[PDB]
A paper describes a structure:
Unliganded DaCHI1 was crystallized in the C2221 space group with two molecules in the asymmetric unit. Our analytical ultracentrifugation results showed that DaCHI1 is a monomer in solution with a standardized sedimentation coefficient of 2.14. The β1 and β2 strands formed a short β-hairpin structure and β3–β7 strands formed an antiparallel β sheet. The substrate-binding cleft of DaCHI1 was conserved, with hydrophobic residues from β3 (Met36 and Ile38), β4 (Ile43, Phe45, and Ile48), β5 (Val94 and Met96), Leu100 of loop 97–101, α4 (Tyr105 and Val109), α6 (Ile190), and Val196 of loop 192–197. Several important catalytic residues including Arg34 (Arg36), Thr46 (Thr48), Tyr105 (Tyr106), Lys108 (Lys109), Asn112 (Asn113), and Ser189 (Thr190) were also preserved (residues in parentheses refer to those in MsCHI).
This is followed by the intramolecular and stereospecific cyclization of chalcone into (2S)-flavanone—a precursor of many downstream flavonoids—by chalcone-flavanone isomerase (CHI; EC 5.5.1.6). Type I CHIs—which are found in most plants including barley, rape, petunia, Arabidopsis, and rice—isomerize naringenin chalcone (2',4',6',4-tetrahydroxychalcone) into 5-hydroxy-flavonoid; whereas type II CHIs, common in leguminous plants, utilize both naringenin chalcone and isoliquiritigenin (2',4',4-trihydroxychalcone) to synthesize 5-deoxy-flavonoid. The family of genes encoding CHI in Deschampsia antartica—one of the only two vascular plant to naturally colonize the Maritime Antarctic—was recently characterized at the molecular level.
Author numbering:
A (entry chain B), B (entry chain A): 1 to 119, 122 to 216
The structure:
Amino acid sequence: AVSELEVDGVVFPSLARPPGSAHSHFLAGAGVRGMEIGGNFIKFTAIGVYLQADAAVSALAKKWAGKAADELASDAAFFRDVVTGEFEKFTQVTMILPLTGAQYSEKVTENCVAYWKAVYTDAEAAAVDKFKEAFKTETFPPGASILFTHSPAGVLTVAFSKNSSVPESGGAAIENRPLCEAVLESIIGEHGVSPAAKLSLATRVAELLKEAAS
Amino acid sequence: AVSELEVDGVVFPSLARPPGSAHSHFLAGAGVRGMEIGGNFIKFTAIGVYLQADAAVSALAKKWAGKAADELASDAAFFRDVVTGEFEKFTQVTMILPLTGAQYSEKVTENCVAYWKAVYTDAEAAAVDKFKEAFKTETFPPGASILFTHSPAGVLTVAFSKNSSVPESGGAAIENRPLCEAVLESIIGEHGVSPAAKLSLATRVAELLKEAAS
């Protein structure tokens, strides 16, 4: 089934074919990402979350079938299950405000870094280095998108999309399951950077799970 | 290394990550689809042809290395080798003059099955109707793009892009070598709709094989 959603101006297609992926993805959820400055919620980006067209839902249904929107929303194990699921995920980050690749890299990376510090090998450091070198000569105006593909393997594909042409390569694919998962968890995790996305996601997947029961 | 190509407004990235593909592709060449009408020369389409980054150069290099761009542009066998090669290709079709899903579908359908008419196994008829239906309810204003991915064995992945978002799916992949190859040969083949794209292609690929050949 599944519908297309519009966050701010950004329009997210219902069914998609991501770069670096052989399968179609359905729009699982979408929502604004912003900051709290001076007691005001400034919107920075619009995030869309896509899941593998049939792998996901079948996979989720085993622990989450029957459960409702609020129930799924109130459970961290759910969002960790979609983050870690044995299927392809995809994330679209479209800009409302302008960001630079350096700053973006800087604190999607530094928090993964910090956490891994607390418990972080050389594979992690290398993956991070490839990530930010992928990002530091780039610019993102309003409308510019970042396309993240999270393959079931831990391979992270990075594409960029100003305008309507083919997504442009962000470099070589980065094969590091911790970073690949972490990029997505920064969004949907427990201290997920976009609560709106999580709510939408939970609601829609709930609907899809009930619909299976013919 | 390659360069970005601008074609009446449409920007083609030098290094792309197409949907349906694990690999990066390099912009092999790009040019308009044009046609003489009355007073002037009307631009219909802007087409970009991409080849699998690592593999294309290697596969083409032993029949066509050393050979000059002159020689390539002149010989149809070369373009047959690009169409037929054991590497994956990608092509982007960008409007900049409004067309329908229908209009384009049947743009390509007959000519293939005209060829197939004379020299037509069901698999082609079925594939043709899956293609046709994959397009039927879509509409392409100026700026919109069709994104075709051709795997080595001839499975065709279709996507659409009217913005900076992740490409929207055109449905299930179409597995048929004749049609998959036909879609690209319609562009760079003997009766190839865009001569300019071939010229560009020969020019760039020649320098690439020289570069890579020692």
